[PDB]
Design a binder for this molecule. Structure first.
Ligand code: HEM
Ligand code: HEM
Ligand SMILES: CC(C)(C)OC(=O)N[C@@H](CS[C@@H](Cc1ccccc1)C(=O)NCCc1cccnc1)Cc1cccc2ccccc12
Ligand SMILES: CC(C)(C)OC(=O)N[C@@H](CS[C@@H](Cc1ccccc1)C(=O)NCCc1cccnc1)Cc1cccc2ccccc12
Lengths: 443, 443
């Protein structure tokens, strides 16, 4: 089974038996994807155990898989287990059950619904300043992820449910999902062990965080919100499926929002001029520290360039994947049934044949003077096509709203302990080795 | 393999294939052991999957297995996995590695060392009264296990290490070891799945409590104690084996001490006369609320009768087991290699052919006028022989010391919510269904 890509004439590193090519993951997913993108070219294949992976970098081929041939062939992501009752979570769900859930939740983030959330997000923007002013009046390096995470948690809890929480350090036991070496190295490389753990109620999500969130949502039936949108569409949605969806939203609303914001601040400190240009624009659109509104956030263009260049340098995706569910021949390339087509997003976001000086932080790539020279199937921080990020527009809102309220009040300088250059987590997920600490100064 | 006991002419319930007799565990271990002890007699056999179990109730046969033929045949308990690095814990350890550890820790609880711990245990006895006086001056039903557990934790931490903690509710993340239905039903009945989970770092003890206790012991190398006894015998003991032993002591020092004390209080409230007779003796040996000392505790005889009758009614053991490691013929009964000889302690502690009115709490069984009519191989709350409870003498001390300090100061009456009669946990471990709540009144 380790000779499929040799058959199709698709290059790739030689796999060791059983292990495939996982030993190349010692420098992490991303360093391996960049190496092969240089070593082999536009299309190559490797193995995660006995699961062949077809990496494609052709924008047409990427558009065909993400957008064109989505509903017919490339509908599902690579399977993820054991998960227990989280099998109904939309992002894991497959085929018709996913389509049923995706439409069931698409009206959550309409521009009408997102506008309604601006007065709610406006409250916790001030709690963020106050919690910052404390660690600013005392010259004490601030761990941004702790205070950003404290902010994103309060926002996602109210925008989708109705519960608040003010720093009583729903308590954000969102402390699981620790990706790394075993026991994930075993499952991806030895896959039929997943049905074993499933029948044992063994779950990659710990029992503590689940039963804690399993009950907490029950207190959320106080007698239009996301949860208010689910019972109105239940009145056939299970009582347990509703919780699985909730857990998806709370996690992504906390981790990803606080992570990208932290990455964003590290970039603004390491480039003081960029932070000046961005602060000068926020005072131009919202003077006297004017309250940021839905229409002002979409107006700020440099803010959007700072968000996207950060997302370019730190794609919290790294890869996009779809399982090819039947034989096809996309763009003159036959692809057998079962292969996992993979888009190496991280490598694509640094390919010198698309970006000038790819490693340097330069918001000016995404200027309207230059954003024409940017292929939207090379740069897809929120994915693309029917199965792209369902929270994209809301997340770009929540991040931009907070970036405004903070930059109106403080500035950010590096510390002695600030890791420069920042080493990415050579592990699995896209994080830093050492956390991000920056000095905060009040204006 | 389900026909061994049919071969040996040893009666027992018919096993279903694969499952054996585990379906009889619906009423818990103990109800099943009492039924068979009546249904079949002095010796019977069943199956926990494909592991046959020989239950023996003959005192001679019990003495032979626990005491006589211990070192040669019945050395090890039934195997317990997956456990990870806890394989070196003395209570799991086997053959020569256990003997090495058992001698290495036997001098921990000498009468010289136990006497040294009385002035230490005397401190937290007063914190127990104060924490009781709060919930006593406010007529609020008290959960005994919470406050007893808060006490036993402070005692075991200092008597073996040197760290204290005063109710800041080592924080006693001793909240794992949840025995019950799956995934334990799978392992005991389907056993070769244990080596699977072992190679995945999967562990019946959660990673949170381990890494929390794995590090906390490192802070315990401040530059004669249990820990002080281990490095002096290390100067070949591993750095990791030392932690595994510690985890054994902290758990048993917290859970079992607080559990038996809770059971003891429920019995004293449901029998007001017994509590009067016990309080009258404590005032006779320690008047003016005299501080309890090593020699006064061993002097109190009714205190000892209240502890043992409670332990008779609630054997935190329920069963004792040893793996028969080679073919033998004990007491005219051949026993093949591999069988798990089992002593059904709970059933034996209520056999009407040894105790008069076995279900009624009656301290007067264990009076020196009657303690001759009590077979020490029927009543073994601390086991027996070389592998009996290594903490027995210290636990009987710690419990009796606390029972004195509390009964000197308060009395205990039932509540409206106090479960009467107390339903045992129909689950696995020996606990109650509903927790024990009792009214506290100051004298
Ligand atoms: C900077 C923030 C975020 C980024 C960069 C991001 C990116 C992504 C990406 C790349 C995907 C996979 C898309 C694909 O396979 O084509 C995805 C999926 C998803 N995201 Fe996000 N996301 C972000 C924030 C959020 C937020 C705030 C939510 C709130 C609910 C959210 C909910 C989801 C869901 C439910 C999916 C599942 C998509 C499906 O299979 O239908 N994301 N996201
Ligand atoms: C009421 C309190 C306790 C009771 C009823 C009790 C009872 C028992 C029993 C029945 C056994 C198995 C004996 C056998 O198989 O023959 C045992 C083993 C053990 N107990 Fe306890 N115990 C108590 C408290 C403690 C305490 C406070 C410690 C403190 C360290 C402790 C440490 C141990 C250890 C290390 C073993 C392992 C024996 C071995 O395999 O060498 N126990 N206990
Ligand atoms: C990537 C790796 C190897 C670390 O593995 C996974 O992250 N794979 C998840 C399933 S694909 C994930 C989308 C995604 C793909 C690639 C990169 C980043 C995200 C997705 O849709 N995530 C749902 C919410 C979310 C998270 C982050 C950003 N946007 C949205 C498995 C997973 C992760 C975390 C929480 C989960 C909760 C319930 C069910 C599955 C969960
Ligand atoms: C009994 C059942 C099915 C619930 O299973 C186990 O309890 N079987 C344990 C291994 S035999 C246990 C002795 C024992 C036998 C029978 C009944 C009660 C106790 C033993 O020696 N326990 C060590 C400390 C202790 C506990 C209680 C009382 N006295 C001492 C497995 C086990 C349990 C708890 C913590 C552990 C920590 C490290 C390694 C193993 C551990």
């Amino acid at each position: 089974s380790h000779g499929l890509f040799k058959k199709l004439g698709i290059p790739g590193p030689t796999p060791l038996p059983f292990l495939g090519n996982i030993l190349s993951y010692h420098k992490g997913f991303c360093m391996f994807d960049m190496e092969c993108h240089k070593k082999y070219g536009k299309v190559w294949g490797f193995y995660d155990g006995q699961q062949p992976v077809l990496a494609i970098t052709d924008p047409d081929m990427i558009k065909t898989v993400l957008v064109k041939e989505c509903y017919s062939v490339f509908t599902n992501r690579r399977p993820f287990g054991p998960v227990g009752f989280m099998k109904s979570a939309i992002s894991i769900a497959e085929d018709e059950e996913w389509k049923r859930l995706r439409s069931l939740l698409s009206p959550t983030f309409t521009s009408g619904k997102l506008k309604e959330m601006v007065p709610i997000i406006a409250q916790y923007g001030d709690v963020l300043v106050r919690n910052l002013r404390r660690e600013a009046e005392t010259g004490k390096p601030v761990t941004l992820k702790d205070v950003f995470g404290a902010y994103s948690m309060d926002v996602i809890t109210s925008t989708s449910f109705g519960v608040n929480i003010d720093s009583l350090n729903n308590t954000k036991k969102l402390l699981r999902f620790d990706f790394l070496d075993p026991f994930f190295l075993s499952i991806t490389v030895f896959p039929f062990l997943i049905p074993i753990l499933e029948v044992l109620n063994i779950c990659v999500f710990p029992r503590e965080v689940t039963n804690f969130l399993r009950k907490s949502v029950k207190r959320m039936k106080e007698s239009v919100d996301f949860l208010q949108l689910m019972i109105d569409s239940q009145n056939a949605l299970s009582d347990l499926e509703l919780v699985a969806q909730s857990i998806i939203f709370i996690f992504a609303g906390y981790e990803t929002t606080s992570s990208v914001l932290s990455f964003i601040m590290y970039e603004l400190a390491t480039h003081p001029d960029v932070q000046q240009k961005l602060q000068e624009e926020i005072d131009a659109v919202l003077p006297n520290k004017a309250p940021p509104t839905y229409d002002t956030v979409l107006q700020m263009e440099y803010l959007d360039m700072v968000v996207n260049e950060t997302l370019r340098l730190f794609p919290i995706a790294m890869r996009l994947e779809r399982v090819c569910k039947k034989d096809v021949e996309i763009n003159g390339m036959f692809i057998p049934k079962g292969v996992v087509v993979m888009i190496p997003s991280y490598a694509l976001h640094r390919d010198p044949k698309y970006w000038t000086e790819p490693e340097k932080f330069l918001p000016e790539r995404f200027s309207k003077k230059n954003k024409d020279n940017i292929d939207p199937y090379i740069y897809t921080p929120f994915g693309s096509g029917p199965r792209n990020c369902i929270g994209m527009r809301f997340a770009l809102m929540n991040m931009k709203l907070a970036l405004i309220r903070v930059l109106q009040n403080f500035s950010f300088k590096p510390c002695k302990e600030t890791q420069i250059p920042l080493k990415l987590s050579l592990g699995g997920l896209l994080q830093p080795e050492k956390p991000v600490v920056l000095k905060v100064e009040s204006r």
